[PDB]
């Protein structure tokens, strides 16, 4: 499991999170597979997934319920748990209530990170981002960051936040390209921000060209065309990805991910499908 630092903490976390999405529910509950689901994170964090992203949107709610059966096989303290407050309750109250809420299904005393999940333009920035740092100040928190914030909102949030902002987590794969396209990536590595990647490997949908660029550098390291991916993304300068993998060999996989080593012109080819 490779490690970097989150933002300029000092501290250093799984550079692979275990995304959550679809585990327990995907926009409502599903109960149906909940002891299956907790063995599935339990294996992940046993092998080191100890970066968990989830949030209070995530199966209405049962997917932190999942998380927090799933971690009480280990010392809290060793895991990152990383979740989100959705666009409808950026308000303070509403905020705090989540967070709260979030608490009691995790069935735990603090978020490591806490993100805005999506903006919401009808609510001032200023309100949400002071909500938040009445949750660090409490010990709720540990550290916040936002969601889908491209960079002149990043930037507009660094200047409202009385709190560091540690990471913006966005869309970003081999043929996503927003954040180089807009200037966040290089604006996140000359500030100190992480650029959180999700759907790393773009839900495994990509075109054929791209595909026989990855297939020859996948046969050169004896790789998965999606281990080249996430390779890719874990050779920038404060790029950490989170991919979902719901299955044993997938997180197996993507583990080997972290010890590829890419020369520079395959990171120069890479770079180019895009
Ligand atoms: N901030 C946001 O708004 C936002 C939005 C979307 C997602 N996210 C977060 O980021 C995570 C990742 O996003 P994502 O699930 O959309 O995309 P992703 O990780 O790129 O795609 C997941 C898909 O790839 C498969 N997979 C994983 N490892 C694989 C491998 N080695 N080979 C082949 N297939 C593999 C999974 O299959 P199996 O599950 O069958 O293994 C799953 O179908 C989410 O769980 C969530 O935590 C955040
Ligand atoms: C577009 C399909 C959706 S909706 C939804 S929530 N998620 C996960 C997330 O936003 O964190 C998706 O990937
Ligand atoms: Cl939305
Ligand atoms: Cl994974």
Redesign the pocket.
Known sequence: MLYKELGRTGEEIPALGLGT?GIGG??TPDYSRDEEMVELLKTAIKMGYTHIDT?E??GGGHTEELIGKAIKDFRREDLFIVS?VWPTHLRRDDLLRSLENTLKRLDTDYVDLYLI??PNPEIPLEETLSAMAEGVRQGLIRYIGV??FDRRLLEEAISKSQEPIVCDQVKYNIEDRDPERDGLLEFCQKNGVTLVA??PLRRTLLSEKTKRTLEEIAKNHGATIYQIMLAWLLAKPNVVAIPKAGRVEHLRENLKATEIKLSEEEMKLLDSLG
Do not use: G, L, P, V
């Open positions: 999405w995907f926009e949030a949107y995530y989100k999940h999506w969601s889908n999700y759907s």
